[model samples]
Target: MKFTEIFPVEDANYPYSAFIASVRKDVIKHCTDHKGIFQPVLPPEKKVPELWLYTELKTRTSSITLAIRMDNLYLVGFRTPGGVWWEFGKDGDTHLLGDNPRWLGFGGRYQDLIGNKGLETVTMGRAEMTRAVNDLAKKKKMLEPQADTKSKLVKLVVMVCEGLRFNTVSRTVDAGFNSQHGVTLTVTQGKQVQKWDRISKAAFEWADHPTAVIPDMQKLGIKDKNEAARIVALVKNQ
Candidate 1:
């Protein structure tokens, strides 16, 4: 899909989501325009070098990401609340950063936060991850006093419209539990739009069959079977 189809500035509502959409836009543009200058950095060390062929820009507060990776020149984005880093890619494969709690035992603990044997990477596509993070940030900002009222009701709709997709819409009146989030769950090639209500019992049951959800999921970059199941549970329930 064309870049504009994926991220549109004029249609954006939330400031942060717009900012992120722009970042994705600029990153793609820069890579395409400066293909020769873009180079991959070596594998991880204690910290990223000041100068690398390709780099992930970071500030003090936001998550860290790698715009490109070694040799292959593919993109990688990283996020971590503590020691272990979660990596997201256009390929849809989620990777866990090894030997974490680096230099110290900083990220060595989180049983309470994750439960079980501590949390593991959840498989998600590049677009899905972007939407998830943007949506989550939007929710967090909602608890603030000075949030933009118009932005809160806005939904970041990403679709493959005639191979040209972008987000431009507000949440439906029954945006809550009904209508399965009051937004389209999946988009098909060419041009078509479909919406459904609370996940039907048959739909939820379908998720129980790996054959139904596994292939579609891997194409979206979600590889782990258990992770896929967990997500299915959440999606089917919601």
Candidate 2:
């Protein structure tokens, strides 16, 4: 089966979902143009660097991404009396940063601030992060960023160019494709042969599998074992 045959895409709606789609477009654009670039995505530390490359590539645009810990978003939701996640996080992954006594503590700490005040605080934090990113871009003259030859700014530029690939997207795709492929091959072929094929293929062509691709799948809400199995079968046949 061809990719179009099994995994067809319709018009996207959610902004969060669309954001991921944009990442997909960027990955394809980079791969087709620069096949041998570091990897599809970069490592965690290099996430912003990758966005920098894509931004620079666009003539009239610059991109800024602020990835606060997911904990922070959860915190904002909880600091109020009506916080729902207070109970949700009870059994879910505890935010490492949420164990504090003041604002930084777990959701329960904010149990007294429900209603308007808590909501206001959440809005404030988001606005603050955005303002900070904007101020940074302005100070760096990103619209006309540094152009000199010997400045350390070159290091920042390199971080964005190479680091992004090494850190983020490459890492994402490597995991996504491989995990999916691994299961499909295993179920289709049996243990011994599948293991051999996985290692051999990964050492070569799919070295970047389970990297750039997997994270993208997670963003698409396809990280479940069954979901992964389904996508893998489709991609494998394709």
Candidate 3:
């Protein structure tokens, strides 16, 4: 019900899947490599249960909209609320777009592609998230939770829309269907950018910018960043 609540961002009703996907790869990778996705839940044998989700983001359009995408392993098990895990994958149609054609290798059968170029085929694992979270906790000198004993959920989110693209077609249908083109790509935006900066140490570092998170920017009547910031904080805090 509160999902429609306005935030600082432009599109409040937009689907959260792509937004979450933006940095899902990096987040998951960091978590898996360092902390491990397995969490310990009581009343279930007290064992380290694996987080049975293997997801990756992809793109539908490369030119106009980056169309960042999120995909899961071909077939995997998902734990249900009733102590059940279901196996599912790719129940929807996907159009892989990029310069590299490697997407064809991942069971992607494109019969109506316009360009001759292929998809880049970038992918990351849950290990990345495991590393990021565990390192983050350690860096803060906080009480670390046992990776196998805690029941915490790892959520990957992006605050800014840098490489995102807009689209006119109705690829997603969660928020009100406003088809004037929107961010398509899903990648890291802040600390993750700084991590990339550390690797390059180039002339410019992405971490230097102010990272802002908004629930919806387009719907906001006031366009000022300051006022929008206040609204975003309120929505997120609630």
The C-alpha lDDT values of all candidates are 0.26, 0.24, 0.22
On TM-score, the leading prediction is 1
Q: Which ten residues in a row have the lowest lDDT in candidate 2?
A: 1-10
Each prediction's TM-score against the native? 0.24, 0.21, 0.18
Where does candidate 1 clash, by residue pair? 5-165, 83-107, 92-221
- For residues 1-238, could you state the per-residue lDDT of candidate 1 as single tens digits? 1122222212223233333444344334323221111111122322332211222222223222332332222223222333243322212333333343111111111221122421111112223324443432323221234322112111211211101111211111112112222333332210111111122122333445534543444454445444333222112111
Could you give the C-alpha RMSD of every candidate to the true structure, in order shown?
15.9, 19.5, 19.8
Which scores greater on lDDT, model 1 or model 3? 1
Off by over 4 Å in 1: 1-17, 32-77, 87-182, 185-187, 190-238
Candidate 2, 1-238: lDDT as tens digits: 0010111111122221233344344433333221322223222232112221112111012223221121111112111212112111222443332333122122222233232222112211112222322333333221134222112122222122212222222233223322222111112121212122222223223333434334433444444333443332111100
Candidate 3 minimal-lDDT segment of 10 residues: 37-46
* Greater-lDDT candidate between 1 and 2: 1
Where is model 1 poorest over a 10-residue stretch in terms of lDDT? 161-170
Highest-lDDT candidate:
1
Residues 166-208, candidate 3: write the lDDT tens digits.
1111122213223343222133222222122122111111113
By lDDT, the candidates rank as 1, 2, 3
Question: Model 3, stretches more than 4 Å misplaced?
Answer: 1-50, 54-116, 119-179, 182-238
